[PDB]
Design a binder for this molecule. Structure first.
Ligand code: 7TW
Length: 299
């Protein structure tokens, strides 16, 4: 019975929903309740969208948030998830003056690659990975959450006429107007998050589509047909883009050893077709000495 649960506090704000911590007034059980408003007051959610969401209840992995229940009405979609206390953004901020320790960076990266390898094998993308979307617990786990699946599945989410989007983790093929996404978009985002854990600063904090593109280009070099065959045929490519030279990855994430820099370079490959897959990245030598430390969380 999903009304013995009462809202305790607002957890966060997604791109189309607000999330609450909800507590069972008799058992104490706590869940995360995501409420997504729709663009309609009467028409509800299409059955085909509910079909696709509901299948994810039975596709489970330790590094993906668990979807517990799907509830829909004439004007709202509610998704009930397992609750975790903290996220990677908050943990980064607490660790910012010192740095998340390397063994924990490596463990979190490995786990997130395991989660992506799973969803990608089931033909599901995340599409909007950001540190605030990665949930952590006292036991050393990290989990993919806040998947960007509402529009992909046809949920008629409310349109926000003045929406402010964070573009910092967006793959360059999206910014250049690619008509079809691939699983490689999530590897790019995760590479950006990897670099952010190491350097304690977002890698490409752009403030518009062109500023995001130009920040990538000023670091990795303006892409051309040599490094990204097909780039000049992307819908938003402009031959008039300024031509910046590529910076060495030794300058991009300096403290990182050559094993880590090599993996990062494969995660940030311009061509999505040659960007490393999550499954291949799990075999990279950077992970030879991976362990599972626990963070010190102050809850
Ligand atoms: O996280 C969200 O907010 C979210 C939003 C919508 N939506 O709005 O349509 C739909 C699904 C969502 N999460 C699914 C989490 C999930 C469980 N098992 C999986 C297996 C593979 C890939 C993903 C998952």
């Amino acid at each position: 019975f999903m009304e013995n649960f009462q809202k305790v506090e607002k957890i966060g704000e997604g791109t189309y929903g607000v999330v609450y911590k909800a507590r069972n007034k008799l058992t104490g059980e706590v869940v995360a309740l995501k409420k997504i408003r729709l663009d309609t007051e009467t028409e509800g959610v299409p059955s085909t969208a509910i079909r696709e969401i509901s299948l994810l209840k039975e596709l489970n992995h330790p590094n993906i948030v668990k979807l517990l229940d799907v509830i829909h009405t004439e004007n709202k979609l509610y998704l009930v998830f397992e609750f975790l206390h903290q996220d990677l953004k908050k943990f980064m901020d607490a660790s910012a003056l010192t740095g998340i320790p390397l063994p924990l960076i490596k463990s979190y990266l490995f786990q997130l690659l395991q989660g992506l390898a799973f969803c990608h094998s089931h033909r599901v993308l995340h599409r909007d990975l950001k540190p605030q979307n990665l949930l952590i617990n006292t036991e050393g786990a990290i989990k993919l959450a806040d998947f960007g699946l509402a529009r992909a599945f046809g949920v008629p989410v409310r349109t926000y006429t003045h929406e402010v989007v964070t573009l910092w983790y967006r793959a360059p093929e999206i910014l250049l107007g690619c008509k079809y996404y691939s699983t490689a978009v999530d590897i790019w985002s995760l590479g950006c998050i990897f670099a952010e854990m190491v350097t304690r600063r977002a890698l490409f904090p752009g403030d518009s589509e062109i500023d995001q593109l130009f920040r990538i280009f000023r670091t990795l070099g303006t892409p051309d047909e040599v490094v990204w065959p097909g780039v000049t045929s992307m819908p938003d490519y402009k031959p008039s883009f300024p031509k910046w030279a590529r910076q060495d990855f030794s300058k991009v994430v300096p403290p990182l050893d050559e094993d880590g820099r090599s993996l990062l370079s494969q995660m940030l490959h311009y061509d999505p077709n040659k960007r490393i897959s999550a499954k291949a990245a799990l075999a990279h030598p950077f992970f030879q000495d991976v362990t599972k430390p626990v963070p010190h969380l102050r809850l």
